[PDB]
Amino acid sequence: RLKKPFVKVEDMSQLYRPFYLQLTNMPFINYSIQKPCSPFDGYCECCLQKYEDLETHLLSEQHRNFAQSNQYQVVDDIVSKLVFDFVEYE
Amino acid sequence: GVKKDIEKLYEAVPQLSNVFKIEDKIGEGTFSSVYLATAQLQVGPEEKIALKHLIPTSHPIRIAAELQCLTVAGGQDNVMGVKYCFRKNDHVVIAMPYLEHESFLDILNSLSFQEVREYMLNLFKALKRIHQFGIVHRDVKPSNFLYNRRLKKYALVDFGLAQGTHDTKIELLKFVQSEAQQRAGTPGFRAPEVLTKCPNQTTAIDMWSAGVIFLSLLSGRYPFYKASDDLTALAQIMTIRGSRETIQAAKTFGKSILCSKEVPAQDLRKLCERLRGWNEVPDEAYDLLDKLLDLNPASRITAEEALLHPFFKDM
Ligand SMILES: Nc1ncnc2c1ncn2[C@@H]1O[C@H](COP(=O)(O)OP(=O)(O)O)[C@@H](O)[C@H]1O
Ligand SMILES: [Mg+2]
Ligand SMILES: [Zn+2]
Protein backbone atom coordinates (compact mmCIF):
# COMPACT_ATOMS: atom_id res chain seq x y z
CA ARG A 1 0.00 0.00 0.00
CA LEU A 2 2.51 2.67 1.14
CA LYS A 3 5.00 4.27 -1.24
CA LYS A 4 8.63 3.48 -0.27
CA PRO A 5 10.66 4.51 1.57
CA PHE A 6 8.43 4.78 4.64
CA VAL A 7 8.40 4.62 8.42
CA LYS A 8 5.15 3.80 10.22
CA VAL A 9 4.52 4.03 13.94
CA GLU A 10 1.48 2.66 15.71
CA ASP A 11 0.49 2.04 19.28
CA MET A 12 -0.14 -1.60 20.17
CA SER A 13 -3.12 -0.62 22.36
CA GLN A 14 -4.68 1.69 19.64
CA LEU A 15 -4.71 4.55 22.21
CA TYR A 16 -3.02 6.55 19.42
CA ARG A 17 -3.53 7.36 15.76
CA PRO A 18 -1.03 5.70 13.38
CA PHE A 19 1.54 8.23 12.15
CA TYR A 20 3.90 8.17 9.16
CA LEU A 21 7.06 9.40 7.50
CA GLN A 22 7.70 9.13 3.75
CA LEU A 23 10.90 10.54 2.35
CA THR A 24 12.56 10.55 -1.07
CA ASN A 25 15.57 8.75 0.42
CA MET A 26 16.11 7.09 3.80
CA PRO A 27 18.80 8.86 5.78
CA PHE A 28 22.23 7.71 4.75
CA ILE A 29 25.33 8.16 6.89
CA ASN A 30 27.71 10.46 4.94
CA TYR A 31 31.31 10.10 6.18
CA SER A 32 32.61 12.32 3.31
CA ILE A 33 31.01 15.65 4.31
CA GLN A 34 33.45 17.68 6.46
CA LYS A 35 33.54 18.21 10.24
CA PRO A 36 31.49 19.48 11.97
CA CYS A 37 28.48 18.80 9.70
CA SER A 38 25.77 16.22 10.42
CA PRO A 39 26.39 12.92 8.55
CA PHE A 40 22.73 13.35 7.65
CA ASP A 41 23.20 16.87 6.33
CA GLY A 42 1.63 31.58 18.17
CA TYR A 43 -0.76 30.22 20.82
CA CYS A 44 -1.69 31.58 24.27
CA GLU A 45 -1.60 29.14 27.19
CA CYS A 46 -3.46 31.64 29.37
CA CYS A 47 -6.29 32.40 26.98
CA LEU A 48 -6.24 28.86 25.50
CA GLN A 49 -6.50 30.33 22.00
CA LYS A 50 -4.42 30.82 18.87
CA TYR A 51 -3.49 34.34 17.76
CA GLU A 52 -2.11 35.91 14.59
CA ASP A 53 -0.17 38.73 16.31
CA LEU A 54 1.40 38.60 19.77
CA GLU A 55 1.65 42.34 20.59
CA THR A 56 -2.02 42.91 19.77
CA HIS A 57 -3.12 39.73 21.58
CA LEU A 58 -1.32 41.00 24.67
CA LEU A 59 -3.55 44.10 24.47
CA SER A 60 -6.81 42.19 23.91
CA GLU A 61 -9.27 42.31 26.84
CA GLN A 62 -9.29 38.55 27.27
CA HIS A 63 -5.51 38.50 27.86
CA ARG A 64 -5.37 41.73 29.84
CA ASN A 65 -7.96 40.36 32.31
CA PHE A 66 -5.95 37.16 32.84
CA ALA A 67 -2.71 39.14 33.19
CA GLN A 68 -4.12 41.13 36.14
CA SER A 69 -5.92 38.28 37.88
CA ASN A 70 -5.09 36.07 40.88
CA GLN A 71 -3.77 33.25 38.66
CA TYR A 72 -0.16 34.16 39.38
CA GLN A 73 -0.53 33.46 43.11
CA VAL A 74 1.25 30.16 42.41
CA VAL A 75 4.26 32.20 41.24
CA ASP A 76 4.14 34.74 44.10
CA ASP A 77 4.11 31.91 46.70
CA ILE A 78 7.47 30.66 45.42
CA VAL A 79 8.75 34.25 45.07
CA SER A 80 7.98 35.00 48.74
CA LYS A 81 10.30 32.09 49.66
CA LEU A 82 13.45 33.52 48.01
CA VAL A 83 15.87 35.96 49.69
CA PHE A 84 16.45 39.32 47.97
CA ASP A 85 20.14 40.18 48.26
CA PHE A 86 20.55 42.97 45.71
CA VAL A 87 20.87 46.70 46.48
CA GLU A 88 17.69 48.48 45.41
CA TYR A 89 17.55 52.19 44.48
CA GLU A 90 14.74 54.75 44.98
CA GLY B 1 17.28 46.64 17.98
CA VAL B 2 18.35 45.08 21.29
CA LYS B 3 18.14 48.59 22.81
CA LYS B 4 14.41 48.73 22.08
CA ASP B 5 13.96 45.29 23.70
CA ILE B 6 15.76 46.27 26.88
CA GLU B 7 13.63 49.44 27.13
CA LYS B 8 10.46 47.41 26.63
CA LEU B 9 11.67 45.01 29.34
CA TYR B 10 12.13 47.79 31.92
CA GLU B 11 8.73 49.18 30.88
CA ALA B 12 7.17 45.74 31.22
CA VAL B 13 8.68 45.11 34.74
CA PRO B 14 9.24 48.49 36.44
CA GLN B 15 11.08 47.06 39.51
CA LEU B 16 14.07 46.02 37.30
CA SER B 17 14.90 49.72 36.86
CA ASN B 18 15.63 50.03 40.59
CA VAL B 19 18.12 47.12 40.55
CA PHE B 20 19.63 46.11 37.19
CA LYS B 21 21.80 47.79 34.60
CA ILE B 22 20.56 45.65 31.69
CA GLU B 23 23.40 45.56 29.21
CA ASP B 24 22.66 43.02 26.46
CA LYS B 25 20.51 40.28 24.99
CA ILE B 26 22.26 36.91 25.26
CA GLY B 27 19.43 34.52 24.40
CA GLU B 28 16.19 34.22 22.49
CA GLY B 29 13.91 31.25 22.13
CA THR B 30 10.30 30.60 21.27
CA PHE B 31 9.35 30.82 24.95
CA SER B 32 11.75 33.34 26.48
CA SER B 33 14.52 35.92 26.03
CA VAL B 34 17.58 36.31 28.21
CA TYR B 35 19.61 39.42 28.97
CA LEU B 36 22.95 40.15 30.53
CA ALA B 37 22.65 42.60 33.42
CA THR B 38 24.90 43.93 36.21
CA ALA B 39 23.75 44.56 39.76
CA GLN B 40 25.06 45.49 43.22
CA LEU B 41 25.02 42.83 45.97
CA GLN B 42 24.29 44.00 49.52
CA VAL B 43 27.39 42.04 50.58
CA GLY B 44 29.75 44.17 48.42
CA PRO B 45 30.63 42.91 44.93
CA GLU B 46 28.95 43.81 41.67
CA GLU B 47 27.66 40.60 40.10
CA LYS B 48 26.79 39.69 36.52
CA ILE B 49 23.24 38.39 36.25
CA ALA B 50 21.27 36.55 33.56
CA LEU B 51 17.67 37.77 33.34
CA LYS B 52 15.26 35.32 31.80
CA HIS B 53 12.15 37.03 30.59
CA LEU B 54 9.44 34.53 30.00
CA ILE B 55 6.92 35.07 27.23
CA PRO B 56 3.62 36.44 28.78
CA THR B 57 1.56 33.91 26.87
CA SER B 58 3.01 31.35 29.34
CA HIS B 59 0.75 29.69 31.88
CA PRO B 60 1.52 30.70 35.48
CA ILE B 61 1.70 26.95 36.44
CA ARG B 62 4.35 26.42 33.75
CA ILE B 63 6.13 29.54 35.02
CA ALA B 64 6.04 28.44 38.68
CA ALA B 65 7.17 24.90 37.80
CA GLU B 66 10.40 26.14 36.14
CA LEU B 67 10.96 28.51 38.99
CA GLN B 68 10.36 25.72 41.54
CA CYS B 69 12.81 23.33 39.77
CA LEU B 70 15.41 26.08 40.03
CA THR B 71 14.63 26.88 43.68
CA VAL B 72 14.50 23.31 44.93
CA ALA B 73 17.08 21.39 42.82
CA GLY B 74 19.32 24.24 41.65
CA GLY B 75 22.30 26.00 43.21
CA GLN B 76 24.35 22.82 43.56
CA ASP B 77 25.87 19.97 41.47
CA ASN B 78 26.08 21.91 38.17
CA VAL B 79 22.38 22.71 38.26
CA MET B 80 21.73 26.49 37.84
CA GLY B 81 20.13 28.20 40.84
CA VAL B 82 17.93 31.31 41.08
CA LYS B 83 18.75 34.55 42.96
CA TYR B 84 15.36 36.22 42.72
CA CYS B 85 12.27 36.55 40.56
CA PHE B 86 10.30 39.68 39.57
CA ARG B 87 6.73 39.90 38.23
CA LYS B 88 4.37 42.52 36.89
CA ASN B 89 1.08 40.94 35.80
CA ASP B 90 1.88 38.46 32.94
CA HIS B 91 5.58 39.42 32.74
CA VAL B 92 7.92 37.31 34.83
CA VAL B 93 11.68 37.70 34.95
CA ILE B 94 13.88 35.06 36.63
CA ALA B 95 17.24 36.34 37.83
CA MET B 96 20.21 33.91 37.92
CA PRO B 97 23.94 34.15 38.31
CA TYR B 98 25.45 34.61 34.84
CA LEU B 99 27.89 31.95 33.65
CA GLU B 100 30.04 32.98 30.70
CA HIS B 101 30.10 29.98 28.33
CA GLU B 102 31.41 28.67 25.04
CA SER B 103 29.48 27.81 21.97
CA PHE B 104 29.35 24.02 21.69
CA LEU B 105 29.98 24.23 17.94
CA ASP B 106 32.94 26.38 18.70
CA ILE B 107 34.95 24.21 21.05
CA LEU B 108 33.63 20.96 19.56
CA ASN B 109 36.69 19.99 17.59
CA SER B 110 39.28 21.61 19.81
CA LEU B 111 38.56 19.82 23.12
CA SER B 112 41.10 17.40 24.52
CA PHE B 113 39.94 13.91 25.38
CA GLN B 114 40.28 14.66 29.06
CA GLU B 115 37.98 17.68 28.63
CA VAL B 116 35.40 15.34 27.06
CA ARG B 117 35.56 13.01 30.15
CA GLU B 118 35.26 16.01 32.43
CA TYR B 119 32.38 17.45 30.45
CA MET B 120 30.44 14.19 30.56
CA LEU B 121 31.21 13.64 34.31
CA ASN B 122 29.89 17.05 35.11
CA LEU B 123 26.79 16.64 33.01
CA PHE B 124 25.98 13.38 34.81
CA LYS B 125 26.35 15.11 38.21
CA ALA B 126 23.67 17.58 37.14
CA LEU B 127 21.37 14.87 35.80
CA LYS B 128 21.89 12.82 39.02
CA ARG B 129 20.80 15.87 41.07
CA ILE B 130 17.63 16.69 39.09
CA HIS B 131 16.62 13.05 38.80
CA GLN B 132 16.86 12.62 42.60
CA PHE B 133 14.04 15.19 42.81
CA GLY B 134 12.06 13.37 40.13
CA ILE B 135 12.60 16.02 37.42
CA VAL B 136 12.58 14.90 33.78
CA HIS B 137 14.36 17.85 32.04
CA ARG B 138 13.15 16.82 28.56
CA ASP B 139 15.48 19.29 26.75
CA VAL B 140 18.97 18.13 27.54
CA LYS B 141 21.21 19.41 24.75
CA PRO B 142 24.30 21.56 24.55
CA SER B 143 22.48 24.96 24.49
CA ASN B 144 20.94 24.06 27.86
CA PHE B 145 24.15 22.89 29.47
CA LEU B 146 26.43 25.83 29.91
CA TYR B 147 30.14 25.27 29.79
CA ASN B 148 32.96 27.55 30.84
CA ARG B 149 36.15 25.86 29.68
CA ARG B 150 38.49 28.30 31.40
CA LEU B 151 37.02 28.03 34.90
CA LYS B 152 35.83 24.45 34.36
CA LYS B 153 32.31 25.33 35.48
CA TYR B 154 29.04 23.91 34.20
CA ALA B 155 25.35 24.48 34.67
CA LEU B 156 22.25 22.77 33.45
CA VAL B 157 19.60 25.43 32.72
CA ASP B 158 16.13 25.84 31.23
CA PHE B 159 13.39 23.89 33.00
CA GLY B 160 10.73 25.39 30.70
CA LEU B 161 9.99 21.92 29.30
CA ALA B 162 10.38 19.83 32.52
CA GLN B 163 7.90 17.19 33.61
CA GLY B 164 7.63 15.14 36.77
CA THR B 165 8.04 11.45 37.39
CA HIS B 166 4.88 9.92 38.91
CA ASP B 167 6.51 10.34 42.35
CA THR B 168 8.13 13.71 41.70
CA LYS B 169 9.20 15.67 44.74
CA ILE B 170 8.38 18.87 42.80
CA GLU B 171 4.69 19.17 43.60
CA LEU B 172 3.92 21.60 40.76
CA LEU B 173 5.35 19.40 37.97
CA LYS B 174 2.22 17.18 38.35
CA PHE B 175 0.23 19.94 36.57
CA VAL B 176 2.32 19.87 33.41
CA GLN B 177 0.26 17.68 31.07
CA SER B 178 2.04 14.89 29.19
CA GLU B 179 2.86 15.68 25.59
CA ALA B 180 1.91 12.02 25.26
CA GLN B 181 -1.46 12.64 26.96
CA GLN B 182 -2.22 15.52 24.54
CA ARG B 183 5.84 22.17 24.44
CA ALA B 184 7.97 19.99 22.09
CA GLY B 185 11.78 19.90 22.17
CA THR B 186 14.42 19.31 19.51
CA PRO B 187 13.70 16.06 17.62
CA GLY B 188 17.44 15.31 17.44
CA PHE B 189 17.90 14.89 21.21
CA ARG B 190 14.65 13.04 21.89
CA ALA B 191 14.70 9.36 22.89
CA PRO B 192 12.82 6.85 20.74
CA GLU B 193 10.06 6.27 23.33
CA VAL B 194 9.55 10.10 23.19
CA LEU B 195 9.73 10.17 19.36
CA THR B 196 7.09 7.40 19.20
CA LYS B 197 4.73 9.14 21.68
CA CYS B 198 5.05 6.56 24.46
CA PRO B 199 2.71 7.61 27.34
CA ASN B 200 5.19 6.58 30.03
CA GLN B 201 8.30 8.77 29.89
CA THR B 202 10.93 8.63 32.61
CA THR B 203 14.24 10.16 33.57
CA ALA B 204 15.88 7.73 31.08
CA ILE B 205 14.85 10.19 28.35
CA ASP B 206 17.42 12.68 29.69
CA MET B 207 20.09 9.95 29.68
CA TRP B 208 19.51 9.27 25.95
CA SER B 209 19.96 13.01 25.40
CA ALA B 210 23.33 12.99 27.19
CA GLY B 211 24.09 10.00 24.97
CA VAL B 212 23.41 12.20 21.90
CA ILE B 213 25.75 14.88 23.26
CA PHE B 214 28.49 12.26 23.95
CA LEU B 215 28.02 11.01 20.41
CA SER B 216 28.62 14.56 19.02
CA LEU B 217 31.70 14.78 21.20
CA LEU B 218 33.15 11.45 20.09
CA SER B 219 32.39 11.95 16.36
CA GLY B 220 33.21 15.71 16.10
CA ARG B 221 29.78 16.25 14.46
CA TYR B 222 27.10 18.63 15.77
CA PRO B 223 24.15 18.67 15.29
CA PHE B 224 24.47 14.94 15.05
CA TYR B 225 20.85 14.12 14.15
CA LYS B 226 19.65 16.96 11.89
CA ALA B 227 15.86 16.55 11.76
CA SER B 228 12.95 18.92 11.66
CA ASP B 229 10.40 16.37 12.89
CA ASP B 230 10.28 13.37 15.24
CA LEU B 231 10.04 10.45 12.79
CA THR B 232 12.94 11.87 10.74
CA ALA B 233 14.99 11.76 13.93
CA LEU B 234 13.74 8.20 14.38
CA ALA B 235 14.76 7.13 10.82
CA GLN B 236 18.17 8.64 11.51
CA ILE B 237 18.40 6.73 14.83
CA MET B 238 17.64 3.41 13.13
CA THR B 239 20.53 4.17 10.76
CA ILE B 240 22.84 4.38 13.77
CA ARG B 241 21.40 1.72 16.07
CA GLY B 242 19.83 -0.58 13.52
CA SER B 243 16.19 -0.81 12.49
CA ARG B 244 15.64 -4.38 13.73
CA GLU B 245 17.10 -3.42 17.10
CA THR B 246 14.84 -0.34 17.25
CA ILE B 247 11.74 -2.26 16.13
CA GLN B 248 12.51 -4.88 18.81
CA ALA B 249 13.01 -2.34 21.60
CA ALA B 250 9.84 -0.39 20.64
CA LYS B 251 7.68 -3.48 21.14
CA THR B 252 8.86 -3.69 24.75
CA PHE B 253 7.22 -0.27 25.23
CA GLY B 254 3.94 -0.86 23.38
CA LYS B 255 4.81 0.62 19.99
CA SER B 256 4.86 -1.13 16.66
CA ILE B 257 7.35 0.34 14.15
CA LEU B 258 7.32 -0.63 10.48
CA CYS B 259 10.35 0.44 8.42
CA SER B 260 10.56 -0.45 4.72
CA LYS B 261 14.36 -0.41 4.39
CA GLU B 262 16.28 -2.57 6.85
CA VAL B 263 19.49 -0.89 7.96
CA PRO B 264 22.14 -2.49 10.28
CA ALA B 265 23.45 -1.27 13.63
CA GLN B 266 26.81 0.47 13.50
CA ASP B 267 29.80 -0.36 15.58
CA LEU B 268 30.15 2.81 17.66
CA ARG B 269 33.94 3.00 17.64
CA LYS B 270 34.21 2.75 13.81
CA LEU B 271 31.34 5.19 13.22
CA CYS B 272 32.91 7.81 15.51
CA GLU B 273 36.49 7.29 14.26
CA ARG B 274 35.49 7.50 10.59
CA LEU B 275 33.53 10.70 11.39
CA ARG B 276 36.20 12.38 13.54
CA GLY B 277 44.52 11.77 23.72
CA TRP B 278 42.28 11.12 20.70
CA ASN B 279 44.62 8.41 19.46
CA GLU B 280 43.80 6.09 22.35
CA VAL B 281 40.13 6.51 23.17
CA PRO B 282 39.44 3.57 25.56
CA ASP B 283 36.83 0.90 24.86
CA GLU B 284 35.00 2.08 27.99
CA ALA B 285 34.09 5.34 26.13
CA TYR B 286 32.24 3.51 23.42
CA ASP B 287 30.87 1.12 26.02
CA LEU B 288 29.30 3.97 28.01
CA LEU B 289 27.94 5.45 24.72
CA ASP B 290 26.28 2.15 23.98
CA LYS B 291 24.59 2.16 27.44
CA LEU B 292 23.33 5.75 27.04
CA LEU B 293 21.97 5.05 23.57
CA ASP B 294 20.22 1.91 24.76
CA LEU B 295 17.06 1.76 22.67
CA ASN B 296 15.23 0.15 25.61
CA PRO B 297 14.39 2.86 28.20
CA ALA B 298 14.11 0.23 31.02
CA SER B 299 17.68 -1.06 30.61
CA ARG B 300 19.20 2.31 29.63
CA ILE B 301 21.90 3.39 32.11
CA THR B 302 20.91 5.86 34.92
CA ALA B 303 22.88 9.00 35.84
CA GLU B 304 24.16 7.59 39.14
CA GLU B 305 25.12 4.36 37.28
CA ALA B 306 27.06 6.46 34.66
CA LEU B 307 29.15 8.19 37.33
CA LEU B 308 30.30 4.73 38.47
CA HIS B 309 31.21 3.70 34.93
CA PRO B 310 34.85 2.68 34.48
CA PHE B 311 35.07 5.42 31.80
CA PHE B 312 35.33 7.77 34.80
CA LYS B 313 37.95 5.80 36.73
CA ASP B 314 39.45 7.48 38.64
CA MET B 315 38.16 11.05 38.94
N1 LIG C 1 22.30 31.57 33.91
C2 LIG C 1 22.83 31.87 32.70
N3 LIG C 1 24.08 32.38 32.55
C4 LIG C 1 24.54 32.68 31.32
N5 LIG C 1 23.84 32.50 30.18
C6 LIG C 1 22.60 32.02 30.21
C7 LIG C 1 22.02 31.67 31.50
N8 LIG C 1 20.79 31.20 31.27
C9 LIG C 1 20.58 31.24 29.93
N10 LIG C 1 21.68 31.73 29.31
C11 LIG C 1 21.78 31.88 27.84
O12 LIG C 1 20.45 32.13 27.36
C13 LIG C 1 19.96 31.04 26.57
C14 LIG C 1 18.45 30.84 26.74
O15 LIG C 1 18.12 30.39 28.06
P16 LIG C 1 17.15 29.13 28.30
O17 LIG C 1 16.96 29.05 29.81
O18 LIG C 1 17.77 27.92 27.61
O19 LIG C 1 15.77 29.54 27.63
P20 LIG C 1 15.21 29.28 26.13
O21 LIG C 1 15.89 28.09 25.50
O22 LIG C 1 13.75 29.09 26.43
O23 LIG C 1 15.59 30.55 25.40
C24 LIG C 1 20.80 29.85 26.97
O25 LIG C 1 20.82 28.85 25.96
C26 LIG C 1 22.14 30.49 27.34
O27 LIG C 1 23.00 30.63 26.24
MG1 LIG D 1 17.21 26.67 26.32
ZN1 LIG E 1 -3.65 35.49 26.27
Rg from Cα positions in chain A: 25
As a CATH number, domain A42-82 is 6.10.250.3410
B111 Ramachandran zone, left/alpha/beta (phi>0; psi -120 to 50): beta
Residue B18 CB: number of other CB atoms within 10 A? 12
The answer to whether residues B21 and A36 touch, using CB atoms and an 8 Å cutoff, is: no
Please give the interface size between A and B, counted as residue pairs whose CB atoms are below 8 Å apart: 180
Rounded to a whole number of angstroms, the distance from the CA of B170 to the nearest CA of chain A is 12
Domains and CATH numbers, chain B: 1-99 (3.30.200.20), 100-168+183-273+280-315 (1.10.510.10)
Burial B115-147 (b: 16+ CB within 10 A, else e): ebbbbbbbbbbbbbbbbebbbbbbbbbbebbbb
Residues with Cβ within 8 Å of residue B232, at least 6 apart in sequence: A21, A23, A27, B187
Q: How far apart are the first and last CA of chain A?
A: 72
* Angstrom distance (rounded) from CA A42 to CA B153: 36
The answer to whether residues B204 and A20 touch, using CB atoms and an 8 Å cutoff, is: no
* Angstrom distance (rounded) from CA B55 to CA B238: 36
* Angstrom distance (rounded) from CA B124 to CA B128: 6
Q: What is the resolution of this structure in A?
A: 2.2
B39 closest CA partner among B15, B62, B61, B64:
B15
Technique that determined the structure: X-ray
* Angstrom distance (rounded) from CA B243 to CA B57: 40
Residue of B77, B90, B106, B139 with catalytic role: B139
Tell me which residue in A12, A40, A83 faces B226 most closely, judged by beta carbons.
A40
Q: What is the DSSP secondary-structure string of chain B? A: -HHHHHHHHHHHSGGGGGT-EEEEEEEE-SSEEEEEEEEEBTTS-EEEEEEEEEPTTS-HHHHHHHHHHHHHT-SBTTB---SEEEEETTEEEEEEE------HHHHGGG--HHHHHHHHHHHHHHHHHHHHTTEE-S--SGGGEEEETTTTEEEE---TT-EE-TT-S-GGGGGS--TTT-----GGG--HHHHTT-S---THHHHHHHHHHHHHHHHT-SSSS--SSHHHHHHHHHHHH-HHHHHHHHHTTTEEEEESS--PPPPHHHHHHHH--TT---HHHHHHHHHHT-SSTTTS--HHHHHTSGGGTT-
* The domain made up of A5-23 is a member of CATH 3.10.129.10: no
Domains A5-23 and A42-82 share a fold: no
B26 is in an annotated binding site: yes
Residues with Cβ within 8 Å of residue B241, at least 6 apart in sequence: B265, B266, B293, B295
Burial B41-78 (b: 16+ CB within 10 A, else e): eeeeeebebbbbbbbbbbbbbbbbbbbbbbbbbbeebb
**What phi, psi does A17 have (nearest 5°)?**
-75, 140
Question: What angle is formed at CA B43 by the lines to CA B42 and CA B47, rounded to 5 degrees?
Answer: 80
Q: Which ligand is nearest to the CA of A68?
A: 3
* Angstrom distance (rounded) from CA B258 to CA A80: 52
The answer to whether residues A43 and A50 touch, using CB atoms and an 8 Å cutoff, is: yes
